[PDB]
Design an enzyme around this catalytic site. Structure first.
Site, PDB file in Angstrom:
ATOM      1  N   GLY A 110      55.918  64.772  22.573  1.00 24.51           N
ATOM      2  CA  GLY A 110      54.699  65.542  22.521  1.00 24.51           C
ATOM      3  C   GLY A 110      54.355  66.187  23.852  1.00 24.51           C
ATOM      4  N   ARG A 149      55.865  72.584  28.218  1.00 24.56           N
ATOM      5  CA  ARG A 149      56.813  73.681  28.273  1.00 24.56           C
ATOM      6  C   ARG A 149      56.346  74.951  27.563  1.00 24.56           C
ATOM      7  N   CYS A 168      62.083  59.205  22.120  1.00 26.56           N
ATOM      8  CA  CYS A 168      63.160  59.996  21.500  1.00 26.56           C
ATOM      9  C   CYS A 168      64.530  59.842  22.187  1.00 26.56           C
ATOM     10  N   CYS A 216      65.284  57.734  18.621  1.00 25.31           N
ATOM     11  CA  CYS A 216      66.127  58.664  17.901  1.00 25.31           C
ATOM     12  C   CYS A 216      67.553  58.768  18.375  1.00 25.31           C
ATOM     13  N   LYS A 245      69.680  55.445  18.542  1.00 18.07           N
ATOM     14  CA  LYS A 245      69.748  54.972  17.163  1.00 18.07           C
ATOM     15  C   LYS A 245      70.805  55.748  16.383  1.00 18.07           C
ATOM     16  N   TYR A 287      60.962  51.532   7.888  1.00 17.85           N
ATOM     17  CA  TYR A 287      62.213  52.211   8.208  1.00 17.85           C
ATOM     18  C   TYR A 287      63.007  51.694   9.396  1.00 17.85           C
ATOM     19  N   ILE A 288      62.323  51.289  10.458  1.00 18.28           N
ATOM     20  CA  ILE A 288      63.020  50.795  11.637  1.00 18.28           C
ATOM     21  C   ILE A 288      63.785  49.533  11.275  1.00 18.28           C
ATOM     22  N   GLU A 321      66.812  50.333   9.085  1.00 14.48           N
ATOM     23  CA  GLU A 321      67.841  50.962   9.908  1.00 14.48           C
ATOM     24  C   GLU A 321      68.571  49.959  10.755  1.00 14.48           C
ATOM     25  N   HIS A 325      79.425  74.378  -5.679  1.00 14.99           N
ATOM     26  CA  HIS A 325      80.285  73.332  -6.247  1.00 14.99           C
ATOM     27  C   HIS A 325      81.600  73.213  -5.468  1.00 14.99           C
ATOM     28  N   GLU A 377      74.048  70.287  -5.168  1.00 14.31           N
ATOM     29  CA  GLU A 377      73.890  71.154  -6.331  1.00 14.31           C
ATOM     30  C   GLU A 377      73.132  70.450  -7.473  1.00 14.31           C
TER      31      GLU A 377
HETATM   32  C1  LIG Z   1      63.665  52.704  17.120  1.00 10.78           C
HETATM   33  C2  LIG Z   1      63.009  54.059  16.802  1.00 10.78           C
HETATM   34  C3  LIG Z   1      63.679  54.987  16.002  1.00 10.78           C
HETATM   35  C4  LIG Z   1      63.083  56.193  15.694  1.00 10.78           C
HETATM   36  N1  LIG Z   1      63.813  57.088  14.966  1.00 10.78           N
HETATM   37  C5  LIG Z   1      63.254  58.300  14.709  1.00 10.78           C
HETATM   38  C6  LIG Z   1      64.044  59.322  14.070  1.00 10.78           C
HETATM   39  O1  LIG Z   1      65.228  59.164  13.764  1.00 10.78           O
HETATM   40  N2  LIG Z   1      63.412  60.527  13.828  1.00 10.78           N
HETATM   41  C7  LIG Z   1      62.097  60.756  14.212  1.00 10.78           C
HETATM   42  O2  LIG Z   1      61.602  61.853  13.998  1.00 10.78           O
HETATM   43  N3  LIG Z   1      61.374  59.816  14.798  1.00 10.78           N
HETATM   44  C8  LIG Z   1      61.920  58.612  15.097  1.00 10.78           C
HETATM   45  N4  LIG Z   1      61.186  57.684  15.781  1.00 10.78           N
HETATM   46  C9  LIG Z   1      59.773  57.979  16.149  1.00 10.78           C
HETATM   47  C10 LIG Z   1      59.703  58.920  17.429  1.00 10.78           C
HETATM   48  O3  LIG Z   1      60.504  58.378  18.430  1.00 10.78           O
HETATM   49  C11 LIG Z   1      58.270  59.025  17.934  1.00 10.78           C
HETATM   50  O4  LIG Z   1      57.434  59.428  16.860  1.00 10.78           O
HETATM   51  C12 LIG Z   1      58.070  60.021  19.110  1.00 10.78           C
HETATM   52  O5  LIG Z   1      59.062  59.856  20.053  1.00 10.78           O
HETATM   53  C13 LIG Z   1      56.803  59.792  19.757  1.00 10.78           C
HETATM   54  O6  LIG Z   1      56.599  60.777  20.857  1.00 10.78           O
HETATM   55  P1  LIG Z   1      55.376  60.717  21.797  1.00 10.78           P
HETATM   56  O7  LIG Z   1      55.500  61.836  22.709  1.00 10.78           O
HETATM   57  O8  LIG Z   1      54.176  60.590  20.975  1.00 10.78           O
HETATM   58  O9  LIG Z   1      55.582  59.380  22.548  1.00 10.78           O
HETATM   59  P2  LIG Z   1      56.699  58.770  23.548  1.00 10.78           P
HETATM   60  O10 LIG Z   1      57.996  59.380  23.313  1.00 10.78           O
HETATM   61  O11 LIG Z   1      56.609  57.341  23.525  1.00 10.78           O
HETATM   62  O12 LIG Z   1      56.225  59.236  24.893  1.00 10.78           O
HETATM   63  C14 LIG Z   1      55.217  58.506  25.680  1.00 10.78           C
HETATM   64  C15 LIG Z   1      55.584  58.607  27.144  1.00 10.78           C
HETATM   65  O13 LIG Z   1      54.377  58.511  27.946  1.00 10.78           O
HETATM   66  C16 LIG Z   1      54.615  57.628  29.019  1.00 10.78           C
HETATM   67  N5  LIG Z   1      53.369  56.997  29.404  1.00 10.78           N
HETATM   68  C17 LIG Z   1      52.593  56.091  28.713  1.00 10.78           C
HETATM   69  N6  LIG Z   1      51.481  55.810  29.349  1.00 10.78           N
HETATM   70  C18 LIG Z   1      51.455  56.523  30.509  1.00 10.78           C
HETATM   71  C19 LIG Z   1      50.531  56.627  31.561  1.00 10.78           C
HETATM   72  N7  LIG Z   1      49.342  55.985  31.556  1.00 10.78           N
HETATM   73  N8  LIG Z   1      50.878  57.387  32.630  1.00 10.78           N
HETATM   74  C20 LIG Z   1      52.055  57.996  32.625  1.00 10.78           C
HETATM   75  N9  LIG Z   1      53.016  57.995  31.688  1.00 10.78           N
HETATM   76  C21 LIG Z   1      52.659  57.237  30.607  1.00 10.78           C
HETATM   77  C22 LIG Z   1      55.623  56.626  28.488  1.00 10.78           C
HETATM   78  O14 LIG Z   1      56.388  56.071  29.538  1.00 10.78           O
HETATM   79  C23 LIG Z   1      56.492  57.428  27.587  1.00 10.78           C
HETATM   80  O15 LIG Z   1      57.624  57.925  28.327  1.00 10.78           O
HETATM   81  C24 LIG Z   1      61.758  56.486  16.144  1.00 10.78           C
HETATM   82  C25 LIG Z   1      61.085  55.563  16.929  1.00 10.78           C
HETATM   83  C26 LIG Z   1      61.715  54.370  17.308  1.00 10.78           C
HETATM   84  C27 LIG Z   1      61.002  53.412  18.257  1.00 10.78           C
HETATM   85  C1  LIG Z   2      92.593  76.352  -5.542  1.00  9.59           C
HETATM   86  C2  LIG Z   2      91.187  76.784  -5.992  1.00  9.59           C
HETATM   87  C3  LIG Z   2      90.060  76.252  -5.362  1.00  9.59           C
HETATM   88  C4  LIG Z   2      88.797  76.657  -5.747  1.00  9.59           C
HETATM   89  N1  LIG Z   2      87.732  76.051  -5.143  1.00  9.59           N
HETATM   90  C5  LIG Z   2      86.486  76.403  -5.558  1.00  9.59           C
HETATM   91  C6  LIG Z   2      85.343  75.687  -5.051  1.00  9.59           C
HETATM   92  O1  LIG Z   2      85.437  74.738  -4.269  1.00  9.59           O
HETATM   93  N2  LIG Z   2      84.105  76.102  -5.505  1.00  9.59           N
HETATM   94  C7  LIG Z   2      83.971  77.129  -6.429  1.00  9.59           C
HETATM   95  O2  LIG Z   2      82.851  77.431  -6.816  1.00  9.59           O
HETATM   96  N3  LIG Z   2      85.020  77.786  -6.893  1.00  9.59           N
HETATM   97  C8  LIG Z   2      86.275  77.430  -6.521  1.00  9.59           C
HETATM   98  N4  LIG Z   2      87.353  78.060  -7.077  1.00  9.59           N
HETATM   99  C9  LIG Z   2      87.145  79.170  -8.049  1.00  9.59           C
HETATM  100  C10 LIG Z   2      86.782  78.604  -9.490  1.00  9.59           C
HETATM  101  O3  LIG Z   2      87.720  77.638  -9.843  1.00  9.59           O
HETATM  102  C11 LIG Z   2      86.801  79.724 -10.521  1.00  9.59           C
HETATM  103  O4  LIG Z   2      85.958  80.775 -10.073  1.00  9.59           O
HETATM  104  C12 LIG Z   2      86.339  79.301 -11.945  1.00  9.59           C
HETATM  105  O5  LIG Z   2      86.920  78.103 -12.302  1.00  9.59           O
HETATM  106  C13 LIG Z   2      86.730  80.289 -12.917  1.00  9.59           C
HETATM  107  O6  LIG Z   2      86.249  79.898 -14.273  1.00  9.59           O
HETATM  108  P1  LIG Z   2      86.602  80.712 -15.537  1.00  9.59           P
HETATM  109  O7  LIG Z   2      85.943  80.057 -16.648  1.00  9.59           O
HETATM  110  O8  LIG Z   2      86.324  82.119 -15.265  1.00  9.59           O
HETATM  111  O9  LIG Z   2      88.137  80.541 -15.639  1.00  9.59           O
HETATM  112  P2  LIG Z   2      89.155  79.300 -15.844  1.00  9.59           P
HETATM  113  O10 LIG Z   2      88.580  78.065 -15.341  1.00  9.59           O
HETATM  114  O11 LIG Z   2      90.451  79.684 -15.372  1.00  9.59           O
HETATM  115  O12 LIG Z   2      89.231  79.180 -17.338  1.00  9.59           O
HETATM  116  C14 LIG Z   2      90.151  79.985 -18.157  1.00  9.59           C
HETATM  117  C15 LIG Z   2      90.658  79.128 -19.296  1.00  9.59           C
HETATM  118  O13 LIG Z   2      90.991  79.981 -20.423  1.00  9.59           O
HETATM  119  C16 LIG Z   2      92.237  79.577 -20.944  1.00  9.59           C
HETATM  120  N5  LIG Z   2      92.895  80.718 -21.547  1.00  9.59           N
HETATM  121  C17 LIG Z   2      93.408  81.852 -20.954  1.00  9.59           C
HETATM  122  N6  LIG Z   2      93.851  82.713 -21.839  1.00  9.59           N
HETATM  123  C18 LIG Z   2      93.653  82.194 -23.083  1.00  9.59           C
HETATM  124  C19 LIG Z   2      93.919  82.660 -24.380  1.00  9.59           C
HETATM  125  N7  LIG Z   2      94.436  83.884 -24.626  1.00  9.59           N
HETATM  126  N8  LIG Z   2      93.663  81.821 -25.414  1.00  9.59           N
HETATM  127  C20 LIG Z   2      93.172  80.618 -25.155  1.00  9.59           C
HETATM  128  N9  LIG Z   2      92.859  80.056 -23.976  1.00  9.59           N
HETATM  129  C21 LIG Z   2      93.108  80.909 -22.936  1.00  9.59           C
HETATM  130  C22 LIG Z   2      93.006  79.040 -19.750  1.00  9.59           C
HETATM  131  O14 LIG Z   2      93.973  78.093 -20.155  1.00  9.59           O
HETATM  132  C23 LIG Z   2      91.967  78.386 -18.913  1.00  9.59           C
HETATM  133  O15 LIG Z   2      91.868  76.993 -19.268  1.00  9.59           O
HETATM  134  C24 LIG Z   2      88.627  77.658  -6.753  1.00  9.59           C
HETATM  135  C25 LIG Z   2      89.744  78.197  -7.372  1.00  9.59           C
HETATM  136  C26 LIG Z   2      91.025  77.734  -7.040  1.00  9.59           C
HETATM  137  C27 LIG Z   2      92.236  78.260  -7.803  1.00  9.59           C
HETATM  138  S1  LIG Z   3      65.227  63.391  21.797  1.00  9.44           S
HETATM  139  C1  LIG Z   3      64.233  64.533  22.752  1.00  9.44           C
HETATM  140  C2  LIG Z   3      63.509  65.603  21.932  1.00  9.44           C
HETATM  141  N1  LIG Z   3      64.445  66.639  21.472  1.00  9.44           N
HETATM  142  C3  LIG Z   3      64.395  67.137  20.237  1.00  9.44           C
HETATM  143  O1  LIG Z   3      63.566  66.754  19.406  1.00  9.44           O
HETATM  144  C4  LIG Z   3      65.043  68.484  20.031  1.00  9.44           C
HETATM  145  C5  LIG Z   3      63.996  69.517  19.588  1.00  9.44           C
HETATM  146  C6  LIG Z   3      64.523  70.928  19.314  1.00  9.44           C
HETATM  147  N2  LIG Z   3      65.595  71.308  20.263  1.00  9.44           N
HETATM  148  C7  LIG Z   3      63.370  71.933  19.463  1.00  9.44           C
HETATM  149  O2  LIG Z   3      62.338  71.810  18.742  1.00  9.44           O
HETATM  150  O3  LIG Z   3      63.508  72.844  20.328  1.00  9.44           O
HETATM  151  C8  LIG Z   3      62.338  66.116  22.754  1.00  9.44           C
HETATM  152  O4  LIG Z   3      61.714  65.362  23.499  1.00  9.44           O
HETATM  153  N3  LIG Z   3      62.153  67.424  22.745  1.00  9.44           N
HETATM  154  C9  LIG Z   3      61.185  68.022  23.626  1.00  9.44           C
HETATM  155  C10 LIG Z   3      61.569  69.454  23.893  1.00  9.44           C
HETATM  156  O5  LIG Z   3      60.742  70.172  24.507  1.00  9.44           O
HETATM  157  O6  LIG Z   3      62.701  69.847  23.486  1.00  9.44           O
END
Ligand SMILES: Cc1cc2nc3c(=O)[nH]c(=O)nc-3n(C[C@H](O)[C@H](O)[C@H](O)COP(=O)(O)OP(=O)(O)OC[C@H]3O[C@@H](n4cnc5c(N)ncnc54)[C@H](O)[C@@H]3O)c2cc1C
Ligand SMILES: Cc1cc2nc3c(=O)[nH]c(=O)nc-3n(C[C@H](O)[C@H](O)[C@H](O)COP(=O)(O)OP(=O)(O)OC[C@H]3O[C@@H](n4cnc5c(N)ncnc54)[C@H](O)[C@@H]3O)c2cc1C
Ligand SMILES: *SC[C@H](NC(=O)CC[C@H](N)C(=O)O)C(=O)NCC(=O)O
Ligand SMILES: *SC[C@H](NC(=O)CC[C@H](N)C(=O)O)C(=O)NCC(=O)O
EC number: 1.8.1.7
Lengths: 461, 461
Positions: free
Chosen positions: A14, A20, A41, A46, A49, A180-181, A184, A450, A455
């Site tokens: 914060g 900034r 953070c 964060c 972790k 959550y903590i 995790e 797909h 999806e």
């Molecule tokens: C284990 C853990 C995992 C988490 N995982 C996530 C996650 O994955 N994603 C997420 O979004 N959130 C996560 N959070 C929550 C997130 O970290 C906090 O919500 C966020 O960092 C809080 O920011 P802040 O600025 O409010 O406080 P802080 O980051 O705590 O900042 C406070 C700062 O002020 C300083 N300070 C305190 N008092 C004074 C004072 N009197 N004078 C000078 N300096 C002082 C402290 O030293 C500290 O550096 C997690 C939290 C924890 C503890």
């Molecule tokens: C290697 C590969 C990877 C791909 N990966 C992706 C992917 O990751 N994501 C994605 O979205 N798309 C992917 N595609 C494209 C996707 O598979 C096709 O766009 C889609 O399957 C086409 O469907 P269709 O029903 O038009 O044809 P088809 O699935 O080919 O169906 C045609 C069917 O009609 C039958 N047929 C033909 N002629 C006759 C006939 N005269 N009488 C009776 N039956 C007949 C055939 O036997 C066949 O079974 C990939 C394609 C390939 C080849």
């Molecule tokens: S873990 C430190 C924090 N970084 C992030 O959350 C990245 C934020 C993005 N890059 C963004 O919103 O720009 C943090 O303390 N960020 C403070 C900051 O000013 O980036």
């Protein structure tokens, strides 16, 4: 008393984001930080972790190796190898953010800030006083721990902070919490080899998420080998000759309570909540409002009850996420420095991803929230459950569950919930769509990609 | 002459999808198929390809094992283990689709269809005649191969169909073509261990995609070990004592042409194009219009020039993708059987994913298409290039590139292009957003999800 245009207390997400953006608008800003820039953070959240989650993901993929035609990998995970690389990465980030501040010409005041009794809002850092017409408190929070008064030996356990200091993988670990903590941490430790138990007060984890997610997440944890201890809580912890011994009470409704001893525990991790960092700010000296937990109260524009003092981030207690602290901080800078009085963050439709195994993605209302808000008669849900194509050739299986919550006649999409492989990178785009007020028709009119799991959300019937 | 309400020729994606939606609307339908139901999608395309891509992905992750603290896996990939599991999976799918047809009460006429000279549109399958007031041709296409007249020995190479019959990994392979199928095949073969060369006529692959993608994809291929033979084409192929010997001409502009012999080639795969399957339909007997390639010409409503005869899918030659054949087929069924005359597929903003390494996701216009359509003065692009956090601790690296193409003052998002880890599951949601006419502001007003690669698209500046 050195004066600035903007004084930000806290150098985390914060604080940095707001300072900034303000500097970009021409403001002379300064950021006070008593520890490491990057805050939660970068240092203990964060970033470290996610590196550990990527490591856990490698573990699961290693299980599927033989099924995919490869030789089996032997196993032995070396924790300190990754710990060391992770620490280095965090170090690179601290240097990067420091540099970001300097290039924007933002002054960094190193030390602990606290308000003074001076009439106009003023702070003191190491004997020196600083003031600004706009002061932002972005001090964040801390992990909460039980008091030894209620749970004897509670201080023997560690929090998420302590997790990031571990230099070895604990052989036996017990995580306490159902948020959550907790999920995790349990997920990473188990995937990496620790004999893991997750102790929760009820029957499911993430009970504030949509029920389909809490149910499914609970099952996936068990399927992955995590022992979920339901309706259980710690009564006491003690140090034995080798490890800790945890005494827990399990009280299943309709059954008699039973006390159990969990022995030879290497790691007890408390993941029960977060406490705001405000106790040492001397807020009272200015009469700044806080709730009974210590959170600073703010309005929709992040204003506190005092003019010229604002708050964003974890310290306010709502939507505790990095991107939320950042967006609120930036919107504020534009409000104050670009004079856009309508600049504020909309706390609705904020997306979240829980880095579980598989990950969870959620945005909008849960089915229960839509029902309460629109009425049962006006809520229609669509869902699917399938096994991702990736598991078509594996003995190990995971499921993908997706749910769409629509409201009213037009079937406006008000909520999306899912768990499955790839859900972490799948959510952002649908969140843009929901933020735009998409209806089921818009989803249905978008051609699918797909073969993918994503999806399924555009082909629900 | 047995009469039906709907007669579908072809049992692939277009045919099945349309027949099934028609049956839902009360139509008595029948599907003629001369081979395996599921067509290209199930048998020789999407499905087997994706299983092989997942296998290739395992290979890359095995390279990063040691960097993530794990022991090194030895290597030896066993092709027939996965081939066998893949074939079985395809078998399960053929059974599933057959069952889908029966439950909907769709009659399956097994055989090759061909039109007769009868006045009213009629087909004959194995001596029996069938007719319907609505007849859909969804016969698809085939891989194109060079004629021995122009490329001596061309018949020694295989196509994508032949790729799916391989029972062993070819030690040395040369893929000819620069389109998506070619790129995908080269990517899988190389990741799995084959000494791979990709031979292209110009300097980059996927030249019809946005230039940022063609450039980046070409570089990623080389970085991953694929030898891209530029400005080269096969002059002749011949069978030697051990493998094939390919003679190629390389003609770099501003240089003299040079002939090269590529020896000991185990697999030569032609991935140069697709030919429509219409030659044996006796189209001429009804005067059904086709272009000079054999594609059936259709209007926006999939109508051919003959009343009561339609065409969808690969046989029409446009947007050759499974989801396109399916959507066009379903829209048609609603037009004919639900009397919605406005029911037709919008061929704009169709998303595509190329299963390369990393995958590619694209939807909308490329920068050059937006420039031509709106004018240089009205086109603004935003882009980013970064190294995904996954590679923060690995010696091996890949890049993620993203590009947003906006048009006019409002910065309407008219195109998104990207390549990077997770891009395969990232595209669907943004495609919904672009289909809704999102502007850069809508993207920017959506809160990001951290830490992910997808959040970069909503934080572009
Ligand atoms: C284990 C853990 C995992 C988490 N995982 C996530 C996650 O994955 N994603 C997420 O979004 N959130 C996560 N959070 C929550 C997130 O970290 C906090 O919500 C966020 O960092 C809080 O920011 P802040 O600025 O409010 O406080 P802080 O980051 O705590 O900042 C406070 C700062 O002020 C300083 N300070 C305190 N008092 C004074 C004072 N009197 N004078 C000078 N300096 C002082 C402290 O030293 C500290 O550096 C997690 C939290 C924890 C503890
Ligand atoms: C290697 C590969 C990877 C791909 N990966 C992706 C992917 O990751 N994501 C994605 O979205 N798309 C992917 N595609 C494209 C996707 O598979 C096709 O766009 C889609 O399957 C086409 O469907 P269709 O029903 O038009 O044809 P088809 O699935 O080919 O169906 C045609 C069917 O009609 C039958 N047929 C033909 N002629 C006759 C006939 N005269 N009488 C009776 N039956 C007949 C055939 O036997 C066949 O079974 C990939 C394609 C390939 C080849
Ligand atoms: S873990 C430190 C924090 N970084 C992030 O959350 C990245 C934020 C993005 N890059 C963004 O919103 O720009 C943090 O303390 N960020 C403070 C900051 O000013 O980036
Ligand atoms: S690979 C076979 C094809 N399947 C898919 O594309 C899945 C499509 C979605 N399940 C959907 O749109 O419902 C295919 O031939 N599909 C034809 C069908 O009718 O499902």
């Amino acid at each position: 008393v050195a004066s600035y245009d903007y004084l930000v207390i806290g150098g985390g997400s914060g604080g940095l984001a707001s300072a900034r953006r303000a500097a970009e608008l021409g403001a002379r800003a300064a950021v006070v930080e008593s520890h490491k820039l990057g805050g939660t953070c970068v240092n203990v959240g964060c970033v470290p972790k996610k590196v550990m989650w990527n490591t856990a993901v490698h573990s699961e993929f290693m299980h599927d190796h033989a099924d995919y035609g490869f030789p089996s990998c032997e196993g032995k995970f070396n924790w300190r190898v990754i710990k060391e690389k992770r620490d280095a990465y965090v170090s690179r980030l601290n240097a990067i953010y420091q540099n970001n501040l300097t290039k924007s010409h933002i002054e960094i005041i190193r030390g602990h800030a606290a308000f003074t009794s001076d009439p106009k809002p003023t702070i003191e850092v190491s004997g020196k006083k600083y003031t600004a017409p706009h002061i932002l408190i972005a001090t964040g929070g801390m992990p909460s721990t039980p008091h030894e008064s209620q749970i004897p030996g509670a201080s023997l356990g560690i929090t998420s902070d302590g997790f990031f200091q571990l230099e070895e993988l604990p052989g036996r670990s017990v995580i306490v919490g159902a948020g959550y903590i907790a999920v995790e941490m349990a997920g990473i430790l188990s995937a990496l080899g620790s004999k893991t138990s997750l102790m929760i007060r009820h029957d499911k984890v993430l009970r504030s998420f949509d029920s389909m997610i809490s149910t499914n997440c609970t099952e996936e944890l068990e399927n992955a080998g995590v022992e979920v201890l339901k309706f259980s809580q710690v009564k006491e912890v003690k140090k034995t000759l080798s490890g800790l011994e945890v005494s827990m009470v399990t009280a299943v409704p309709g059954r008699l309570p039973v006390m159990t001893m969990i022995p030879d525990v290497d790691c007890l991790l408390w993941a029960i909540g977060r406490v705001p960092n405000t106790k040492d700010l001397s807020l009272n000296k200015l009469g700044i409002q806080t709730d009974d937990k210590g959170h600073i109260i703010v309005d929709e524009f992040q204003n506190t009850n005092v003019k010229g003092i604002y708050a964003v981030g974890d310290v306010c207690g709502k939507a505790l996420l990095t991107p939320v602290a950042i967006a609120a901080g930036r919107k504020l800078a534009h409000r104050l420095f670009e004079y856009k009085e309508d600049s504020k963050l909309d706390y609705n439709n904020i997306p979240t991803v829980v880095f579980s195994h598989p990950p969870i993605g959620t945005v909008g209302l849960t089915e229960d929230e839509a029902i309460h808000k629109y009425g049962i008669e006006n809520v229609k849900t669509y869902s699917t459950s399938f096994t991702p194509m990736y598991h078509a050739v594996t003995k190990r299986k995971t499921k993908c569950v997706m749910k769409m919550v629509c409201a009213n006649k037009e079937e406006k999409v008000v909520g999306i919930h899912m768990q499955g492989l790839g859900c972490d990178e799948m959510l952002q785009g649908f969140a843009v769509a929901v933020k735009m007020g998409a209806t089921k028709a818009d989803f249905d009119n978008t051609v699918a990609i797909h073969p993918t799991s994503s999806e399924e959300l555009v082909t629900l019937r």
